[PDB]
Amino acid sequence: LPPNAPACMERQLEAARYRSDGALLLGASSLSGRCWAGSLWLFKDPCAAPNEGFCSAGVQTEAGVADLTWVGERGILVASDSGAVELWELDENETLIVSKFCKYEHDDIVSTVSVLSSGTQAVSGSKDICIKVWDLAQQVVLSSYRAHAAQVTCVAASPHKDSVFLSCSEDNRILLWDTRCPKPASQIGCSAPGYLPTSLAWHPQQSEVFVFGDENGTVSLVDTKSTSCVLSSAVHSQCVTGLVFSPHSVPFLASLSEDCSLAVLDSSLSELFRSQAHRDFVRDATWSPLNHSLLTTVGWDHQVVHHVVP
């Protein structure tokens, strides 16, 4: 067990993010029992996770972790139950994880965070209905947007455009943001109102195409250009919680749902692979940078599963 590392990891695994070198960022909350808090873990050996005694580094958070993102190779940006966006920094030796900043800007749970392509800026979304843009170096809020009319489910920064990001809300709006526009937000999606949007992922190559998941288990492919719903599949029997693209030239799409299932789809949104491995909600998926055939999922069942995709 490393120094400053908790003896026990909270049961509810919220996030799993591979770094470039193939080390594994883990986020967990305690969602029941006496104490409702969270932890951040680094596993330089991913096969050891989630066992705390084989972790490279661990720390305890004041509160649960709703969302997580790597900031470069040593930075961890945290969406907390506390309404705080937290910046955590890895050690020189990467032996311990130390809090850079903890800012209480959101008036309710911080549900979602994404680092903008700049790498010096992030967007947070909250149950307080607000979306905030952060200056990470100065540790401040540049802008706060009350665009939506209900809790913000997801924010996803454009891969390569530092001023562009997507947001989706229970107000049933998908918003495309450009901070360079005086009215920075633009409402997008299929014409007809559909089921509530629950998850967003930009295509890693095509700058104007993204996928969204819905509360009804439908995954949909959208071109901002056409601003029309090109392709939809009914992949899940429950809400689509996460959408992750493979690092492949022509990327595979990992689909995760409260139906406790993982799905892998082609670019035609057809189903290549499905895993019923988890026996509770599947929270995250991260493809290995090392072996692109490898997909790691975490769930509230506290399973760290390593998938081999055909």
Partner: protein
């Protein structure tokens, strides 16, 4: 001063959190009873078999703390009106689970959101909880003044915000509340936690909430300004709304993080205490009327019943009121006896309904003031009060005062009267049968005699109060008509209500009444122009009386006699609330009806819609003759 709670959606340790909020000066904590992010599955394998515990232990606080310090919150993922069947089924199950846990804990209150227009299934589930065992705990419906869709920043290029004004649209949040509470059939356990925003709406939107059952006001840290010294403060407009809510004695809830991080969260609370301590102090009336707010009482019938000693005591505890009576008699004596005839001319003054003698004393102080001469008859049918009178006359008044133990309609007077004086008026003037009593007595008034009072007039005004509607409704009793409550008047210090139109005169009586044929029956049609959207629940009643010339008494607010805490208004309820749209007229009809045995009122609303005639043939309510 101010009862205030902290609202949190994050509670790492319940012990520490509770300790912290107490140290800050908060009376109570609103918090989740389950983890807000802990979505639970009730139907689908395998998540259905998720190992517990499903939440933290009841052992973590004392029963006293759970009972007094904690308001529960519905988890935000729970959407019983979702259009997705699976989400609806899971949300129905989760809602019951959370409400059942609250009742398990003995929580004094539980917060539920109205954050959209359709809460039909939410109402159905809550109604089911309420009808599953009889309990006391309150449900606080968290409703915004301004819907979040109407609060959003105008930053969507292709979805601009409509800055065009829509009267009824700006009141949509009230309709969300109305529909919910109508579906839940006006449960007394369902109240409003009104959530206030940075941008207050038009006054009409705020006025919509006037007689509604508001238990809490939620103040986000967001709406507070920063003073020069960096303390949180509020705009004057927010302040004036706070003063309105302090009159309704609501509980204030602070929600959101510390946006004044140069100061502790007690700074928010201290500002509220600052406002409460600096509220424009009340009036003596408001001090008199302190415990009686919206308390329903039976109108006194001092003809049919013999009033108790302490009742006369309160009648007597109004020195301003008898100063008026003294003044009227003073004036009347001087008009009736020129200074040349002062010592030769002794006027016969008869007090009809003398109770324990306050009018006798006023009559005597008047005659010394006028320096004129008076013989007094003190007539009183209540033999209990005659004891008080006869001790008074033996010890103090002497033979100047003849106490008569008799009904003024039966009494054979040894001589005719110059001036009859009476105190026979209820909150609706003629509702204690002053007209019949004085009509009965007028044969023994000299042809040129004066009655004090000479005239009285009843006034009515349509009111909105969902609270008083519910209080009336709660007055169902065994062994009578299950709707009789609605067909009778109540004396009440009207507090949580909205007057929908200026008061209009209803019935008028004059004394003496020289009508060759006298008829005390009445039929009156009133038209109340209404300039608001609202719901009619009943009619406030008031009166004015002319003692003599310009000396009057009034509980009509526009003309209220100052200091006269003597007399709360009366309320005529209706069985079914009536929607009134801005610009519409309320038409009400009132009848004063009689036999040899009884007098009663009947009433009906005929516009914009018709009610049933209330109290037909006095079947629910009569005044004994």
């Amino acid at each position: 001063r101010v009862s205030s709670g902290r609202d949190l959606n994050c509670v790492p340790e319940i012990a520490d959190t509770l300790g912290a909020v107490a140290k800050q000066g908060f009376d109570f904590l609103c918090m989740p009873v389950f983890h807000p992010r802990f979505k639970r599955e009730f139907i689908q394998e395998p998540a259905k078999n998720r190992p517990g515990p499903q939440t933290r232990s009841d052992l973590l606080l004392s029963g006293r703390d759970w009972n007094t310090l904690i308001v529960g919150k519905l988890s935000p993922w729970i959407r019983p009106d979702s259009k997705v069947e699976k989400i609806r089924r899971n949300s129905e199950a989760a809602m019951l689970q959370e409400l059942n846990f609250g009742a398990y804990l003995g929580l004094p209150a539980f917060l539920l959101p109205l954050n959209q227009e359709d809460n039909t299934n939410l109402a159905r589930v809550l109604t089911n909880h309420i009808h599953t065992g009889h309990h006391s705990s309150m449900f606080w419906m968290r409703v915004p003044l301004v819907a979040p869709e109407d609060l959003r920043d105008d930053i969507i290029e292709n979805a601009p915000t409509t800055h065009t004004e829509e009267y009824s649209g700006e009141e949509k949040t009230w309709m969300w509340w109305h529909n919910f509470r109508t579906l839940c059939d006006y449960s007394k356990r369902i109240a409003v936690a009104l959530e206030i925003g940075a941008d207050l709406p038009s006054n009409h939107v705020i006025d919509r909430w006037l007689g509604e059952p508001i238990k809490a006001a939620i103040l986000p840290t967001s709406i507070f300004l920063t003073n020069k010294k960096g303390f949180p403060v509020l705009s004057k407009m927010h302040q004036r709304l706070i003063f309105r809510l302090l009159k309704l004695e609501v509980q204030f809830i602070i929600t959101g993080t510390n946006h004044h991080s140069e100061k502790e969260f007690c700074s928010y609370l201290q500002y509220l205490e600052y406002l409460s301590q600096n509220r424009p102090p009340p009036n003596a009336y408001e001090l008199f009327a302190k415990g009686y707010e919206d308390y329903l009482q039976s109108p006194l019938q001092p003809l049919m019943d013999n009033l108790e000693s302490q009742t006369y005591e309160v009648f007597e505890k109004d020195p301003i009121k008898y100063s008026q009576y003294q003044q009227a008699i003073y004036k009347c004596l001087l008009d009736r006896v020129p200074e040349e005839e002062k010592d030769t001319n002794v006027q016969v003054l008869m007090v009809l309904g003398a109770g324990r003698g306050p009018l006798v004393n006023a009559s005597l102080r008047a005659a010394k003031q006028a320096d004129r001469r008076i013989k007094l008859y003190a007539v009183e049918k209540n033999p209990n009060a005659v004891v008080t009178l006869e001790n008074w006359q033996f010890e103090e008044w002497g033979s100047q005062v003849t106490v008569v133990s008799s009904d003024m309609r039966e009494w054979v007077a040894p001589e005719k009267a110059d001036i009859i004086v009476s105190e026979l008026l209820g909150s609706f003037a003629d509702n204690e049968l002053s007209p019949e009593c004085l009509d009965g007595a007028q044969h023994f008034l000299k042809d040129d005699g004066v009655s004090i009072p000479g005239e009285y007039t009843s006034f009515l005004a349509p009111i909105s109060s969902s609270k008083l509607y519910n209080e009336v409704r709660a007055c169902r009793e065994k062994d009578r008509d299950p709707e009789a409550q609605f067909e009778m008047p109540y004396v009440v210090r009207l507090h949580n209500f909205h007057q929908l139109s200026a008061p209009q005169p209803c019935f008028t009586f004059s004394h003496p009444n020289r009508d060759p044929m006298i008829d005390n029956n009445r039929y009156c049609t009133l038209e109340f122009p209404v300039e608001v959207n609202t719901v009619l629940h009943g009619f406030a009643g008031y009166f004015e009386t002319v003692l003599y010339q310009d000396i009057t008494l009034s509980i009509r607010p526009e003309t209220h006699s100052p200091g006269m805490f003597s007399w709360f208004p009366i309320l005529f309820p209706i069985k079914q609330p009536i929607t009134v749209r801005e610009g519409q007229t309320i038409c009400v009809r009132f009848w004063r009806c009689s036999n040899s045995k009884k007098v009663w009122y009947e009433w009906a609303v005929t516009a914009p819609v018709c009610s049933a005639i209330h109290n037909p043939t006095g079947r629910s309510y009569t005044i004994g003759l």
